[PDB]
Amino acid sequence: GSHMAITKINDCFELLSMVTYADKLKSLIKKEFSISFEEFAVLTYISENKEKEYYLKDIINHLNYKQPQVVKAVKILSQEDYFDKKRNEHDERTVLILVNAQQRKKIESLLSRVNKRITEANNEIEL
Amino acid sequence: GSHMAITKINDCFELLSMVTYADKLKSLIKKEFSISFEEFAVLTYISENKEKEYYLKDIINHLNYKQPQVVKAVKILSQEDYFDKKRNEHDERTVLILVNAQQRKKIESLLSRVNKRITEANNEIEL
Ligand SMILES: [Ca+2]
Ligand SMILES: [Ca+2]
């Protein structure tokens, strides 16, 4: 529906290339922007499914990084004040996060800058 | 010329998907086949540029894993007897990998089995 689907590879050399290309973009986003990929994944997940309230449960489900790293990312991002969030809410499932409609200017702007670096990197590397 | 080129992504959500998909195939190849990705990269590099004699120099150049991990991979693969390879006492020739003809069949055979797992994986994965 939205966003170009990723084309599947069917042999070793294509896999290797895909990984090489993905690793380069990952390291760049981290180098510049100084942010872990899990923080990146949480941030883009939030941007895709716009909301005011998110269940840390769902986020962890829709991502593939294991709670330890995810919660670790939510935590940091929370301090950076990308979204309030706050732990300790007892019973039910666990934790939830709050995305102030204005902290979203902070996120989508960060993601807009990453989108610009991505197209620049595509023009660059092109190995 | 040979092998489907990897299509570039141009935004965060596509990046994330590409990485998710690449990570799954990587972990599988490692889980099963029990082999590191650098060993995989060396092995597919060898299979792409068929030869009898390889300069560990070139291999390290054409790959993006830093000598430490590459040489570490060459070493193991060498014991596994995928290719002979002989070090030095000095000469700075810093290793020269040799793959006779039988070892080649061993390499291709293995990469051939890795190719079939990728296909089965593309049928399960589907995210
Ligand atoms: Ca192919
Ligand atoms: Ca797009």
PDB file of C-alpha atoms and ligand atoms in Angstrom:
ATOM      1  CA  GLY A   1       0.000   0.000   0.000  1.00  0.00           C
ATOM      2  CA  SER A   2       2.647   2.518   1.018  1.00  0.00           C
ATOM      3  CA  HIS A   3       6.411   2.252   0.476  1.00  0.00           C
ATOM      4  CA  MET A   4       8.294   0.266  -2.099  1.00  0.00           C
ATOM      5  CA  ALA A   5       8.331  -3.421  -1.121  1.00  0.00           C
ATOM      6  CA  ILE A   6      11.728  -5.036  -0.758  1.00  0.00           C
ATOM      7  CA  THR A   7      12.581  -7.407  -3.577  1.00  0.00           C
ATOM      8  CA  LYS A   8      13.693 -10.855  -2.498  1.00  0.00           C
ATOM      9  CA  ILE A   9      17.104 -12.210  -3.438  1.00  0.00           C
ATOM     10  CA  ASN A  10      17.521 -15.859  -4.411  1.00  0.00           C
ATOM     11  CA  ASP A  11      21.256 -16.604  -4.161  1.00  0.00           C
ATOM     12  CA  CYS A  12      24.360 -16.009  -2.013  1.00  0.00           C
ATOM     13  CA  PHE A  13      25.934 -13.220  -4.004  1.00  0.00           C
ATOM     14  CA  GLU A  14      22.717 -11.198  -3.930  1.00  0.00           C
ATOM     15  CA  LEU A  15      22.362 -11.784  -0.217  1.00  0.00           C
ATOM     16  CA  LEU A  16      25.904 -10.590   0.374  1.00  0.00           C
ATOM     17  CA  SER A  17      25.310  -7.453  -1.689  1.00  0.00           C
ATOM     18  CA  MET A  18      22.077  -6.702   0.110  1.00  0.00           C
ATOM     19  CA  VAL A  19      23.788  -7.000   3.483  1.00  0.00           C
ATOM     20  CA  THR A  20      26.787  -4.940   2.364  1.00  0.00           C
ATOM     21  CA  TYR A  21      24.446  -2.188   1.186  1.00  0.00           C
ATOM     22  CA  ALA A  22      22.278  -2.390   4.310  1.00  0.00           C
ATOM     23  CA  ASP A  23      25.270  -2.375   6.668  1.00  0.00           C
ATOM     24  CA  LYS A  24      26.647   0.770   5.047  1.00  0.00           C
ATOM     25  CA  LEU A  25      23.397   2.667   5.431  1.00  0.00           C
ATOM     26  CA  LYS A  26      23.077   1.417   9.027  1.00  0.00           C
ATOM     27  CA  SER A  27      26.580   2.450  10.092  1.00  0.00           C
ATOM     28  CA  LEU A  28      26.104   5.868   8.488  1.00  0.00           C
ATOM     29  CA  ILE A  29      22.830   6.568  10.238  1.00  0.00           C
ATOM     30  CA  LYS A  30      24.583   5.570  13.456  1.00  0.00           C
ATOM     31  CA  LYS A  31      27.865   7.412  12.784  1.00  0.00           C
ATOM     32  CA  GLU A  32      26.050  10.620  11.851  1.00  0.00           C
ATOM     33  CA  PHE A  33      22.816  11.143  13.826  1.00  0.00           C
ATOM     34  CA  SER A  34      24.585   9.073  16.502  1.00  0.00           C
ATOM     35  CA  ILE A  35      21.701   6.735  17.266  1.00  0.00           C
ATOM     36  CA  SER A  36      21.381   2.935  17.479  1.00  0.00           C
ATOM     37  CA  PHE A  37      19.383   1.057  14.874  1.00  0.00           C
ATOM     38  CA  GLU A  38      16.814  -0.083  17.429  1.00  0.00           C
ATOM     39  CA  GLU A  39      16.243   3.581  18.264  1.00  0.00           C
ATOM     40  CA  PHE A  40      15.873   4.079  14.509  1.00  0.00           C
ATOM     41  CA  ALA A  41      13.417   1.174  14.225  1.00  0.00           C
ATOM     42  CA  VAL A  42      11.297   2.481  17.097  1.00  0.00           C
ATOM     43  CA  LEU A  43      11.357   5.952  15.635  1.00  0.00           C
ATOM     44  CA  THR A  44      10.323   4.875  12.120  1.00  0.00           C
ATOM     45  CA  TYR A  45       7.700   2.505  13.528  1.00  0.00           C
ATOM     46  CA  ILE A  46       6.194   5.437  15.416  1.00  0.00           C
ATOM     47  CA  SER A  47       6.281   7.546  12.268  1.00  0.00           C
ATOM     48  CA  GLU A  48       4.541   4.892  10.161  1.00  0.00           C
ATOM     49  CA  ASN A  49       1.644   4.236  12.508  1.00  0.00           C
ATOM     50  CA  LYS A  50       1.018   7.792  13.698  1.00  0.00           C
ATOM     51  CA  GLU A  51      -0.627   7.882  17.126  1.00  0.00           C
ATOM     52  CA  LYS A  52      -0.678   9.754  20.446  1.00  0.00           C
ATOM     53  CA  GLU A  53      -0.499   6.624  22.584  1.00  0.00           C
ATOM     54  CA  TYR A  54       1.586   3.513  21.907  1.00  0.00           C
ATOM     55  CA  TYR A  55       1.754   0.186  23.731  1.00  0.00           C
ATOM     56  CA  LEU A  56       5.394  -0.742  24.290  1.00  0.00           C
ATOM     57  CA  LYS A  57       3.965  -4.243  23.915  1.00  0.00           C
ATOM     58  CA  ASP A  58       3.016  -3.791  20.262  1.00  0.00           C
ATOM     59  CA  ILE A  59       6.214  -1.957  19.337  1.00  0.00           C
ATOM     60  CA  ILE A  60       8.310  -4.832  20.678  1.00  0.00           C
ATOM     61  CA  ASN A  61       6.090  -7.247  18.754  1.00  0.00           C
ATOM     62  CA  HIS A  62       6.320  -5.463  15.417  1.00  0.00           C
ATOM     63  CA  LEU A  63      10.096  -5.122  15.707  1.00  0.00           C
ATOM     64  CA  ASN A  64      12.735  -7.867  15.698  1.00  0.00           C
ATOM     65  CA  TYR A  65      15.279  -6.711  18.298  1.00  0.00           C
ATOM     66  CA  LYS A  66      14.360  -8.448  21.589  1.00  0.00           C
ATOM     67  CA  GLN A  67      12.890  -6.455  24.509  1.00  0.00           C
ATOM     68  CA  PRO A  68      16.278  -5.759  26.170  1.00  0.00           C
ATOM     69  CA  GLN A  69      17.485  -3.607  23.262  1.00  0.00           C
ATOM     70  CA  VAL A  70      14.040  -2.201  22.469  1.00  0.00           C
ATOM     71  CA  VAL A  71      13.232  -1.051  26.018  1.00  0.00           C
ATOM     72  CA  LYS A  72      16.828   0.159  26.158  1.00  0.00           C
ATOM     73  CA  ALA A  73      16.077   2.251  23.056  1.00  0.00           C
ATOM     74  CA  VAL A  74      12.681   3.484  24.255  1.00  0.00           C
ATOM     75  CA  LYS A  75      14.378   4.589  27.473  1.00  0.00           C
ATOM     76  CA  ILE A  76      17.048   6.694  25.762  1.00  0.00           C
ATOM     77  CA  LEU A  77      14.638   8.134  23.195  1.00  0.00           C
ATOM     78  CA  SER A  78      12.362   9.027  26.105  1.00  0.00           C
ATOM     79  CA  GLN A  79      15.109  11.053  27.800  1.00  0.00           C
ATOM     80  CA  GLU A  80      15.972  12.688  24.487  1.00  0.00           C
ATOM     81  CA  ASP A  81      12.308  13.645  24.785  1.00  0.00           C
ATOM     82  CA  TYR A  82      11.070  12.181  21.498  1.00  0.00           C
ATOM     83  CA  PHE A  83       8.113  10.794  23.408  1.00  0.00           C
ATOM     84  CA  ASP A  84       7.195  10.931  27.093  1.00  0.00           C
ATOM     85  CA  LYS A  85       6.549   7.301  28.111  1.00  0.00           C
ATOM     86  CA  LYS A  86       7.128   6.275  31.758  1.00  0.00           C
ATOM     87  CA  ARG A  87       7.047   2.600  32.847  1.00  0.00           C
ATOM     88  CA  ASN A  88       5.434   1.502  36.135  1.00  0.00           C
ATOM     89  CA  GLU A  89       1.713   1.066  35.397  1.00  0.00           C
ATOM     90  CA  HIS A  90       1.129  -2.378  36.955  1.00  0.00           C
ATOM     91  CA  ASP A  91      -0.844  -5.463  35.889  1.00  0.00           C
ATOM     92  CA  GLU A  92      -2.124  -6.039  32.340  1.00  0.00           C
ATOM     93  CA  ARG A  93       0.682  -6.316  29.787  1.00  0.00           C
ATOM     94  CA  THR A  94       3.741  -4.083  30.268  1.00  0.00           C
ATOM     95  CA  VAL A  95       4.608  -0.401  29.776  1.00  0.00           C
ATOM     96  CA  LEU A  96       3.271   2.223  27.349  1.00  0.00           C
ATOM     97  CA  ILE A  97       4.662   5.401  25.727  1.00  0.00           C
ATOM     98  CA  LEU A  98       3.299   8.883  25.002  1.00  0.00           C
ATOM     99  CA  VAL A  99       4.105  10.833  21.846  1.00  0.00           C
ATOM    100  CA  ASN A 100       3.399  14.510  22.391  1.00  0.00           C
ATOM    101  CA  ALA A 101       1.975  15.862  19.143  1.00  0.00           C
ATOM    102  CA  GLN A 102       4.911  18.304  19.258  1.00  0.00           C
ATOM    103  CA  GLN A 103       7.647  15.761  19.981  1.00  0.00           C
ATOM    104  CA  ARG A 104       6.576  14.482  16.579  1.00  0.00           C
ATOM    105  CA  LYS A 105       8.171  17.551  15.010  1.00  0.00           C
ATOM    106  CA  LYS A 106      11.365  16.301  16.615  1.00  0.00           C
ATOM    107  CA  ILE A 107      10.934  12.807  15.183  1.00  0.00           C
ATOM    108  CA  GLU A 108       9.714  13.374  11.647  1.00  0.00           C
ATOM    109  CA  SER A 109      12.360  16.066  11.254  1.00  0.00           C
ATOM    110  CA  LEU A 110      15.017  13.590  12.364  1.00  0.00           C
ATOM    111  CA  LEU A 111      13.583  11.044   9.948  1.00  0.00           C
ATOM    112  CA  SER A 112      13.411  13.677   7.185  1.00  0.00           C
ATOM    113  CA  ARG A 113      17.082  14.291   7.677  1.00  0.00           C
ATOM    114  CA  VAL A 114      17.802  10.582   7.588  1.00  0.00           C
ATOM    115  CA  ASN A 115      15.822  10.274   4.351  1.00  0.00           C
ATOM    116  CA  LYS A 116      18.044  12.987   2.843  1.00  0.00           C
ATOM    117  CA  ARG A 117      21.247  11.244   3.956  1.00  0.00           C
ATOM    118  CA  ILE A 118      19.944   7.966   2.500  1.00  0.00           C
ATOM    119  CA  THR A 119      19.490   9.392  -1.002  1.00  0.00           C
ATOM    120  CA  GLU A 120      22.855  11.075  -0.757  1.00  0.00           C
ATOM    121  CA  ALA A 121      24.400   7.749   0.276  1.00  0.00           C
ATOM    122  CA  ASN A 122      22.692   6.025  -2.669  1.00  0.00           C
ATOM    123  CA  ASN A 123      24.329   8.566  -5.004  1.00  0.00           C
ATOM    124  CA  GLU A 124      27.609   7.983  -3.215  1.00  0.00           C
ATOM    125  CA  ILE A 125      28.504   4.321  -2.565  1.00  0.00           C
ATOM    126  CA  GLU A 126      26.684   2.921  -5.608  1.00  0.00           C
ATOM    127  CA  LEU A 127      29.140   0.003  -5.430  1.00  0.00           C
TER     128      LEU A 127
ATOM    129  CA  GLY B   1      26.155  -8.638 -15.930  1.00  0.00           C
ATOM    130  CA  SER B   2      25.418 -11.546 -13.629  1.00  0.00           C
ATOM    131  CA  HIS B   3      23.045 -11.603 -10.654  1.00  0.00           C
ATOM    132  CA  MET B   4      20.055  -9.433  -9.953  1.00  0.00           C
ATOM    133  CA  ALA B   5      21.217  -5.986  -8.772  1.00  0.00           C
ATOM    134  CA  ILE B   6      19.909  -4.832  -5.424  1.00  0.00           C
ATOM    135  CA  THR B   7      17.280  -2.120  -5.677  1.00  0.00           C
ATOM    136  CA  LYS B   8      17.954   0.949  -3.590  1.00  0.00           C
ATOM    137  CA  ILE B   9      15.532   2.075  -0.903  1.00  0.00           C
ATOM    138  CA  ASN B  10      14.808   5.767  -0.384  1.00  0.00           C
ATOM    139  CA  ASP B  11      13.189   6.058   3.052  1.00  0.00           C
ATOM    140  CA  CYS B  12      13.369   4.778   6.641  1.00  0.00           C
ATOM    141  CA  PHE B  13      10.590   2.218   6.509  1.00  0.00           C
ATOM    142  CA  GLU B  14      12.136   0.573   3.450  1.00  0.00           C
ATOM    143  CA  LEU B  15      15.524   0.577   5.089  1.00  0.00           C
ATOM    144  CA  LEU B  16      14.095  -1.082   8.176  1.00  0.00           C
ATOM    145  CA  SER B  17      12.364  -3.757   6.102  1.00  0.00           C
ATOM    146  CA  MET B  18      15.475  -4.458   4.088  1.00  0.00           C
ATOM    147  CA  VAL B  19      17.510  -4.900   7.281  1.00  0.00           C
ATOM    148  CA  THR B  20      14.830  -7.054   8.902  1.00  0.00           C
ATOM    149  CA  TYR B  21      14.764  -9.287   5.840  1.00  0.00           C
ATOM    150  CA  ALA B  22      18.578  -9.394   5.571  1.00  0.00           C
ATOM    151  CA  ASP B  23      19.032 -10.138   9.275  1.00  0.00           C
ATOM    152  CA  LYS B  24      16.662 -13.083   9.091  1.00  0.00           C
ATOM    153  CA  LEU B  25      18.495 -14.658   6.184  1.00  0.00           C
ATOM    154  CA  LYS B  26      21.834 -14.030   7.909  1.00  0.00           C
ATOM    155  CA  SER B  27      20.845 -15.585  11.231  1.00  0.00           C
ATOM    156  CA  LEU B  28      19.408 -18.609   9.428  1.00  0.00           C
ATOM    157  CA  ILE B  29      22.523 -19.241   7.371  1.00  0.00           C
ATOM    158  CA  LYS B  30      24.462 -19.001  10.624  1.00  0.00           C
ATOM    159  CA  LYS B  31      22.029 -21.042  12.761  1.00  0.00           C
ATOM    160  CA  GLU B  32      21.877 -23.837  10.193  1.00  0.00           C
ATOM    161  CA  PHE B  33      25.173 -24.339   8.320  1.00  0.00           C
ATOM    162  CA  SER B  34      26.736 -22.951  11.518  1.00  0.00           C
ATOM    163  CA  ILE B  35      29.078 -20.475   9.863  1.00  0.00           C
ATOM    164  CA  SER B  36      29.776 -16.757  10.382  1.00  0.00           C
ATOM    165  CA  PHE B  37      28.753 -14.265   7.718  1.00  0.00           C
ATOM    166  CA  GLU B  38      32.363 -13.312   6.998  1.00  0.00           C
ATOM    167  CA  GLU B  39      33.029 -16.987   6.267  1.00  0.00           C
ATOM    168  CA  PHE B  40      29.968 -16.790   4.011  1.00  0.00           C
ATOM    169  CA  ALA B  41      31.251 -13.637   2.300  1.00  0.00           C
ATOM    170  CA  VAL B  42      34.674 -15.168   1.689  1.00  0.00           C
ATOM    171  CA  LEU B  43      33.085 -18.327   0.391  1.00  0.00           C
ATOM    172  CA  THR B  44      30.725 -16.560  -2.029  1.00  0.00           C
ATOM    173  CA  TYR B  45      33.489 -14.194  -3.144  1.00  0.00           C
ATOM    174  CA  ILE B  46      35.607 -17.229  -4.014  1.00  0.00           C
ATOM    175  CA  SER B  47      32.684 -18.781  -5.881  1.00  0.00           C
ATOM    176  CA  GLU B  48      32.027 -15.623  -7.920  1.00  0.00           C
ATOM    177  CA  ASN B  49      35.576 -15.072  -9.113  1.00  0.00           C
ATOM    178  CA  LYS B  50      36.587 -18.692  -9.690  1.00  0.00           C
ATOM    179  CA  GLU B  51      40.348 -19.182  -9.413  1.00  0.00           C
ATOM    180  CA  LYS B  52      43.032 -21.573  -8.149  1.00  0.00           C
ATOM    181  CA  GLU B  53      45.046 -18.891  -6.389  1.00  0.00           C
ATOM    182  CA  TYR B  54      43.682 -15.952  -4.392  1.00  0.00           C
ATOM    183  CA  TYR B  55      45.455 -13.021  -2.751  1.00  0.00           C
ATOM    184  CA  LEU B  56      44.143 -12.597   0.787  1.00  0.00           C
ATOM    185  CA  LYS B  57      44.876  -8.948   0.014  1.00  0.00           C
ATOM    186  CA  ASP B  58      42.212  -8.673  -2.683  1.00  0.00           C
ATOM    187  CA  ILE B  59      39.616 -10.654  -0.738  1.00  0.00           C
ATOM    188  CA  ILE B  60      39.937  -8.289   2.216  1.00  0.00           C
ATOM    189  CA  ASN B  61      39.658  -5.361  -0.194  1.00  0.00           C
ATOM    190  CA  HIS B  62      36.532  -6.567  -1.964  1.00  0.00           C
ATOM    191  CA  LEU B  63      34.808  -7.357   1.329  1.00  0.00           C
ATOM    192  CA  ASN B  64      33.690  -4.947   4.059  1.00  0.00           C
ATOM    193  CA  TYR B  65      34.497  -6.793   7.299  1.00  0.00           C
ATOM    194  CA  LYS B  66      37.931  -5.550   8.455  1.00  0.00           C
ATOM    195  CA  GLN B  67      40.997  -7.840   8.296  1.00  0.00           C
ATOM    196  CA  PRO B  68      40.612  -9.167  11.874  1.00  0.00           C
ATOM    197  CA  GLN B  69      37.312 -10.913  11.080  1.00  0.00           C
ATOM    198  CA  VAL B  70      38.272 -11.787   7.501  1.00  0.00           C
ATOM    199  CA  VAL B  71      41.613 -13.423   8.364  1.00  0.00           C
ATOM    200  CA  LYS B  72      39.771 -15.021  11.274  1.00  0.00           C
ATOM    201  CA  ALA B  73      37.319 -16.468   8.737  1.00  0.00           C
ATOM    202  CA  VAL B  74      39.978 -17.514   6.216  1.00  0.00           C
ATOM    203  CA  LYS B  75      41.748 -19.321   9.054  1.00  0.00           C
ATOM    204  CA  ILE B  76      38.721 -21.380  10.102  1.00  0.00           C
ATOM    205  CA  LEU B  77      37.645 -22.096   6.521  1.00  0.00           C
ATOM    206  CA  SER B  78      41.214 -23.222   5.868  1.00  0.00           C
ATOM    207  CA  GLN B  79      41.063 -25.791   8.681  1.00  0.00           C
ATOM    208  CA  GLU B  80      37.639 -26.926   7.488  1.00  0.00           C
ATOM    209  CA  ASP B  81      39.692 -27.514   4.348  1.00  0.00           C
ATOM    210  CA  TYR B  82      37.661 -25.396   1.930  1.00  0.00           C
ATOM    211  CA  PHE B  83      40.941 -24.042   0.604  1.00  0.00           C
ATOM    212  CA  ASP B  84      44.540 -24.700   1.620  1.00  0.00           C
ATOM    213  CA  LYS B  85      46.035 -21.254   2.198  1.00  0.00           C
ATOM    214  CA  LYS B  86      49.524 -20.839   3.613  1.00  0.00           C
ATOM    215  CA  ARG B  87      50.754 -18.062   5.918  1.00  0.00           C
ATOM    216  CA  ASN B  88      54.258 -16.596   6.184  1.00  0.00           C
ATOM    217  CA  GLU B  89      57.297 -16.230   8.438  1.00  0.00           C
ATOM    218  CA  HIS B  90      57.772 -12.775   6.950  1.00  0.00           C
ATOM    219  CA  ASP B  91      57.718 -11.942   3.202  1.00  0.00           C
ATOM    220  CA  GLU B  92      54.740  -9.647   3.902  1.00  0.00           C
ATOM    221  CA  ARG B  93      52.900 -11.691   1.266  1.00  0.00           C
ATOM    222  CA  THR B  94      50.396 -11.928   4.128  1.00  0.00           C
ATOM    223  CA  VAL B  95      48.810 -15.252   3.146  1.00  0.00           C
ATOM    224  CA  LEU B  96      47.786 -16.656  -0.239  1.00  0.00           C
ATOM    225  CA  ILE B  97      44.652 -18.790  -0.475  1.00  0.00           C
ATOM    226  CA  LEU B  98      44.697 -21.868  -2.688  1.00  0.00           C
ATOM    227  CA  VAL B  99      41.640 -23.827  -3.780  1.00  0.00           C
ATOM    228  CA  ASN B 100      42.543 -26.876  -5.871  1.00  0.00           C
ATOM    229  CA  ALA B 101      39.539 -28.383  -7.668  1.00  0.00           C
ATOM    230  CA  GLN B 102      37.978 -30.779  -5.187  1.00  0.00           C
ATOM    231  CA  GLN B 103      37.751 -28.106  -2.502  1.00  0.00           C
ATOM    232  CA  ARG B 104      36.006 -25.950  -5.089  1.00  0.00           C
ATOM    233  CA  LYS B 105      33.370 -28.645  -5.505  1.00  0.00           C
ATOM    234  CA  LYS B 106      33.029 -28.645  -1.719  1.00  0.00           C
ATOM    235  CA  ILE B 107      32.556 -24.863  -1.685  1.00  0.00           C
ATOM    236  CA  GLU B 108      30.027 -24.757  -4.532  1.00  0.00           C
ATOM    237  CA  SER B 109      28.167 -27.729  -3.065  1.00  0.00           C
ATOM    238  CA  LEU B 110      27.774 -25.914   0.233  1.00  0.00           C
ATOM    239  CA  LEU B 111      26.816 -22.587  -1.345  1.00  0.00           C
ATOM    240  CA  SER B 112      24.367 -24.586  -3.447  1.00  0.00           C
ATOM    241  CA  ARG B 113      22.710 -25.857  -0.291  1.00  0.00           C
ATOM    242  CA  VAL B 114      22.709 -22.340   1.133  1.00  0.00           C
ATOM    243  CA  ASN B 115      20.840 -21.215  -1.994  1.00  0.00           C
ATOM    244  CA  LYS B 116      18.058 -23.758  -1.392  1.00  0.00           C
ATOM    245  CA  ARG B 117      17.668 -22.642   2.235  1.00  0.00           C
ATOM    246  CA  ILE B 118      17.288 -19.035   1.086  1.00  0.00           C
ATOM    247  CA  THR B 119      14.392 -20.095  -1.157  1.00  0.00           C
ATOM    248  CA  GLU B 120      12.650 -22.018   1.612  1.00  0.00           C
ATOM    249  CA  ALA B 121      13.285 -18.944   3.772  1.00  0.00           C
ATOM    250  CA  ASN B 122      11.695 -16.591   1.251  1.00  0.00           C
ATOM    251  CA  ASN B 123       8.549 -18.721   1.506  1.00  0.00           C
ATOM    252  CA  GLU B 124       8.347 -18.602   5.314  1.00  0.00           C
ATOM    253  CA  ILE B 125       9.704 -15.106   6.053  1.00  0.00           C
ATOM    254  CA  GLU B 126       7.214 -13.095   4.000  1.00  0.00           C
ATOM    255  CA  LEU B 127       6.921 -10.050   6.286  1.00  0.00           C
TER     256      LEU B 127
HETATM  257 CA    CA C   1      20.108 -14.296  -8.913  1.00  0.00          CA
HETATM  258 CA    CA C   2       9.603   6.083  -0.554  1.00  0.00          CA
END
